[PDB]
Homo-oligomer: A and B are copies of this chain.
Amino acid sequence: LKIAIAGANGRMGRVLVEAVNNHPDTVLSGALEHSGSEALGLDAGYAVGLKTGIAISDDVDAVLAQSDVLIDFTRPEPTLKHLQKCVEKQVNIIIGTTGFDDTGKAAIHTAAEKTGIVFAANFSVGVNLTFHILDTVARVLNEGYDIEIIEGHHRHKVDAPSGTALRMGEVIAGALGRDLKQCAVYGREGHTGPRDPSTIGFATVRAGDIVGDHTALFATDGERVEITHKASSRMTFAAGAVRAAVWVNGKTGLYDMQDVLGL
């Protein structure tokens, strides 16, 4: 199966090149980038230490006609432009880009009538499984358990808490009939007093080169239940994106990552 990778020289895109090689039902077809990046006219797998056999291109027109699926983990605005050409050639698209416009969301809904799209904020199999299970854990442990979300990332991370940590909070709040904006706590200083049963606490660590560590804690008199996900590199997201690409065998419509996983 022929897969194209957008932003092929960027940090995420190089891992996607390795992910296509690792997966058997897949082989590498395209490699797009920005018009003007030094990337152009080099082997896609040269960064990772393979012989890709394909040149990094800046031809959205040419490349999409050969490839069956496109994967995009780039900046949001070029993605809508990439989406438009992908509709035309009857080609599937996996959208990894997050932090997206409200009018932009409607463009993907409309584009889903023409071809198959898997739209998700996080592409890890483990993180998506964690979201599902937190729903079950929250419902069973719904009286007398204190909920905390502990999270660790590298020193360069700008936003706290992560999109993942907040999404974990939304699943737990939604299952317990709470509002996250009303009952979240992001830090503790001084006499925080007795903890309110309704609170969902967020403890955030920013240090070193941590890829992304997330734990959801449920605590009561007698026990603690912890659901933890730990990312070792960006390969976690790439492996899930390639799996989502395999999953769309000509399918049409919009899918969450929960659909590929069967949840």
A interface with B by C-beta (< 8 Å): 22, 46-49, 124-126, 129-130, 132-133, 136-137, 140-141, 144-148, 150, 155-161, 186-195, 197, 199, 201-211, 217-239, 261-263
Nearest Cβ in chain B — how far from A41, in angstroms? 14
Q: When A146-B208, A158-B193, A194-B158 are in contact, do A226 and B226 touch as well, CB less than 8 Å?
A: yes
Task: Give the distance in Å from the alpha carbon of A33 to the alpha carbon of B218 in the complex.
Answer: 35
Task: Give the distance in Å from the alpha carbon of A227 to the alpha carbon of B137 in the complex.
Answer: 11
Name A's interface SS.
mixed
Chain B residues with CB under 8 Å of A225's CB are: 126, 129-130, 228-230
Chain B residues with CB under 8 Å of A207's CB are: 146-148, 195, 201, 217, 219, 224
Shortest Cβ distance from A129 into B: residue = B140
**Is A160 a contact partner of B190 (Cβ separation < 8 A)?**
yes
Known: A156-B195, A222-B238. 7 other contacts (CB 8 A): A126-B224, A130-B225, A155-B219, A161-B189, A186-B188, A188-B206, A224-B228
Shortest Cβ distance from A155 into B: residue = B195
**Is A208 a contact partner of B192 (Cβ separation < 8 A)?**
no
**Is A223 a contact partner of B126 (Cβ separation < 8 A)?**
yes
**Is A231 a contact partner of B223 (Cβ separation < 8 A)?**
yes
Count identical subunits in the complex. 4
**Is A160 a contact partner of B192 (Cβ separation < 8 A)?**
yes
A-B contact pairs, 20 of them (CB 8 A): A124-B222, A126-B224, A140-B262, A148-B205, A150-B205, A156-B194, A186-B188, A186-B189, A188-B204, A207-B224, A208-B219, A208-B221, A208-B224, A209-B233, A209-B235, A211-B232, A222-B233, A226-B229, A227-B227, A228-B228
Task: Give the distance in Å from the alpha carbon of A160 to the alpha carbon of B189 in the complex.
Answer: 5
Task: Give the distance in Å from the alpha carbon of A219 to the alpha carbon of B155 in the complex.
Answer: 9
Task: Give the distance in Å from the alpha carbon of A197 to the alpha carbon of B154 in the complex.
Answer: 12
Task: Give the distance in Å from the alpha carbon of A160 to the alpha carbon of B133 in the complex.
Answer: 29
**Is A209 a contact partner of B186 (Cβ separation < 8 A)?**
no
Task: Give the distance in Å from the alpha carbon of A144 to the alpha carbon of B235 in the complex.
Answer: 13
Across the interface, A124 reaches (CB within 8 A) one of B126, B209, B223, namely: B223
Across the interface, A222 reaches (CB within 8 A) one of B160, B191, B234, namely: B234
Nearest Cβ in chain B — how far from A249, in angstroms? 15
